Amino acid sequence: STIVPVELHSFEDAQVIGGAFRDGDAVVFDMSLLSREEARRIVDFAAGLCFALRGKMQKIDSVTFAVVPE
Amino acid sequence: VPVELHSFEDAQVIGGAFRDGDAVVFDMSLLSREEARRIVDFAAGLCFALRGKMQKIDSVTFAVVPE
């Protein structure tokens, strides 16, 4: 499989990250359209996804992160 | 598991017990509004990943239930 890209518009958009990630796919997500606090929310949700499945989380830049399955 | 949260770092206690297959009940009365939001988002992430159940018990009490 190949990395799923996501352009986030709201916190509900975390469902795309969650859905693809729990299906065993790496997700790269952009938060440039998100506010300071919305990005904080996304990162906390993504951290939760990662911890539960023992995956890897990495910062690419200030508005881009990736969640990688175990 | 009745976790009293002091900061966002205590998310690890919820996470650790939950991914080990245990239901966790956590209290957020000591947290600021910003910290409680962070905990709820993290807990939502834990639940979504493992298809668990998340429920609000009262205003400062939530539960995360596996499988």
């Binding site: 890897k56 910062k59 200030s62 | 998310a11």
Partner: peptide, 8 residues
């Protein structure tokens, strides 16, 4: 600065 939480 928005980073990966330490416990990960």
């Amino acid at each position: 600065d928005l980073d990966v939480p330490s416990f990960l």
